[PDB]
Amino acid sequence: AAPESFDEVYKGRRIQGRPAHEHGGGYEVFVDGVQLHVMRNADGSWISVVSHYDPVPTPRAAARAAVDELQGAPLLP
Amino acid sequence: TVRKNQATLTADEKRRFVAAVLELKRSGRYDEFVRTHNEFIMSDTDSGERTGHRSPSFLPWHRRFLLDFEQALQSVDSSVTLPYWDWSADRTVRASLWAPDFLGGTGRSTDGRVMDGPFAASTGNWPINVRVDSRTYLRRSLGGSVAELPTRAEVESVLAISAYDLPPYNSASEGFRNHLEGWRGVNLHNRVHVWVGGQMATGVSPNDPVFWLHHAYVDKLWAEWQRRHPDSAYVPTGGTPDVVDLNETMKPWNTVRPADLLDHTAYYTFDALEHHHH
């Protein structure tokens, strides 16, 4: 049962999420239109490739954490 | 073939370690270790195939990955071994670890850029090539995202756990492996990645040379756990879908099993490892 989609501007950047050498899938996140690889843990929490050791409760929280980590930098696909 | 606590290295040992790491970077070999690690942490999943992380093979896989890296170092300078970072003891940014003669310090607050040490971008000798964003400079924020490194007391609580691992053999598991990895409990290994910050907090964490020293100490705690629990051993021991059983081979090497890696003394010893005592 996937999380709901989202779309907002967070610290000046557009973050979106939607149910769908990396893993399987389930849910997609984008930061300014560039896909952010994210992953769900068994307990329902999420991580992303920019915070891979620090679980957060939702994909929006993972998107926001990526924006905070990037400090304005574009993601690479 | 002795792995030593980083805090005890001599100036010549620090110098030779740094030079060997930089030569692996210059030759292109270093970045491929970064890429291998990223491919596994991005593919290992709690509900599917899992080998490098979030699974019982977390420990033997990183043991063999570090052995590959140590062997590559020794091809440049045979005297070099991986040192380990006991983050329960050396827990502040004024640890010698973070001095300009070794790994350099924390990142500046504007962009997290490491400004000193041999791996600072300004040296020209440490481009970040394998990356998840466009920044091409080493970053750290020591103690930024989490206040404290694990304490010795916390480490001792994890070492006391007798079972190596337990079904479902993933980030939800009870037992030693997952508590050392950090997904449950007081959190040892994951929290250290978070504490360093910068690339060490991401899938491309071997971009920071401290990766090797952190995992060398995680690997030493596995050895310490074995001595505490001579009656405990790797599990599962056969027939488990998606998980590396004891006598199954492991990707990417395909030619080695957890069973071949349980006894570190086949490859190296530590400066100090207490015997099974009671």
Ligand SMILES: [Cu+2]
């Ligand atoms: Cu994926």
Ligand SMILES: [Cu+2]
């Ligand atoms: Cu890892």
Ligand SMILES: [Cu+2]
């Ligand atoms: Cu790690």
Ligand SMILES: [Cu+2]
């Ligand atoms: Cu005994």
